[PDB]
Amino acid sequence: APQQINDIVHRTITPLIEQQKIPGMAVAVIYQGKPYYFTWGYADIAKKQPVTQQTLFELGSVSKTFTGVLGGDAIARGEIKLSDPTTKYWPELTAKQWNGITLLHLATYTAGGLPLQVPDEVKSSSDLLRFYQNWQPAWAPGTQRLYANSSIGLFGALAVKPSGLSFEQAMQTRVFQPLKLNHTWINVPPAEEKNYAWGYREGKAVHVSPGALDAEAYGVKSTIEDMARWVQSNLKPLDINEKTLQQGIQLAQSRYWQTGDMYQGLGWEMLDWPVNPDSIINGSDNKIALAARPVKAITPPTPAVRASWVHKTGATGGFGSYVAFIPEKELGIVMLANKNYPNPARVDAAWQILNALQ
Numbered sequence: 001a002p003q004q005i006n007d008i009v010h011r012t013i014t015p016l017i018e019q020q021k022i023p024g025m026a027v028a029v030i031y032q033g034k035p036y037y038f039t040w041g042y043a044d045i046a047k048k049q050p051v052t053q054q055t056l057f058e059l060g061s062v063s064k065t066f067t068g069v070l071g072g073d074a075i076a077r078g079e080i081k082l083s084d085p086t087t088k089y090w091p092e093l094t095a096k097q098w099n100g101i102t103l104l105h106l107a108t109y110t111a112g113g114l115p116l117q118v119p120d121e122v123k124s125s126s127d128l129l130r131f132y133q134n135w136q137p138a139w140a141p142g143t144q145r146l147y148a149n150s151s152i153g154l155f156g157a158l159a160v161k162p163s164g165l166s167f168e169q170a171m172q173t174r175v176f177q178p179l180k181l182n183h184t185w186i187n188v189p190p191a192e193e194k195n196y197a198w199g200y201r202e203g204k205a206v207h208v209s210p211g212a213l214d215a216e217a218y219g220v221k222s223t224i225e226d227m228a229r230w231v232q233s234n235l236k237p238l239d240i241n242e243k244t245l246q247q248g249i250q251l252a253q254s255r256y257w258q259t260g261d262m263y264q265g266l267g268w269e270m271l272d273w274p275v276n277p278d279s280i281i282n283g284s285d286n287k288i289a290l291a292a293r294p295v296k297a298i299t300p301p302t303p304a305v306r307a308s309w310v311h312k313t314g315a316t317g318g319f320g321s322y323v324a325f326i327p328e329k330e331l332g333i334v335m336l337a338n339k340n341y342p343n344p345a346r347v348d349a350a351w352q353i354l355n356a357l358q
């Protein structure tokens, strides 16, 4: 814990906790590709369990980075292509709005206005089919970006189909396990319950509720230690010994689409570094992050650019997190908190810390 890391992290996170009234938080800074951890406050207020380096947090949409990388890995394995029609892997989707909608579109929220959430009315596999069959695009495919669980959710489920494994099984065996993320979970097991923080929403203890495509779109829980390892694995995919995985991490950080200052990868979003912090800070606020935006195609996709700020925010009703790293600088940060507080606040903190270490 170099005193300068200590200094920036404390001067930055202390007023962040106080002003946002965050009950518990873990922060990892990756500096020169080595992790340094910081924990505050409570995993469980009622039971006075402190946040530790073992506490599980719900990642929310940061789960989409795992999804984009398990997708990338299926690509590298030869099992899927992003140029393939959604219908190759779901022939029952016969409604003709599906014509022209490829897995790149599902992955990058460019299919033509798939909604943000799957309706809670959808619980069975037949219900989900019905949902996608009935859906009417607002736009032609690859013209507009609209952030959507129902979009990258479906990417995740179709992408694992030719493996013959369930999504969770594919995730575990091709991603969590080779990267040694042994306390990262889609479903948290009884033995691990004791590490599972409560989320806090209006002062009530909550956990994520089950939902269609939850695992694929918002369903990973993880510790600050594995999340640091996750950052390290995406900072330096070339130290990854597993070829399809190292290659899927590259593919998740290719640039497929640009809107304004940002580039859409698989799960990840990227901006050229040096970035203007106003750009990433303001861009992180939801009604601009969740807004319908026109995209320009990157034809062909730019391979992972090292001088990028690569990041993803994610929330559940009781959790807020953020991951950001700069490959060229070997620098990254993870921020896990068991309160959902505004995204700008998160990115603002992350940028002040990484800027000063930059």
Ligand SMILES: O=C(O)c1ccc(CCCNS(=O)(=O)c2ccsc2C(=O)O)cc1
Pocket: 060, 061, 062, 116, 149, 199, 206, 207, 208, 209, 210, 217, 218, 290, 313, 314, 315, 316, 317, 318
């Ligand atoms: O605490 C609970 O009971 C609960 C919380 C969130 C959910 C849904 C997760 C919301 N996160 S998301 O991926 O769907 C999303 C959507 C718009 S922004 C965003 C995010 O994670 O930042 C379900 C149950």
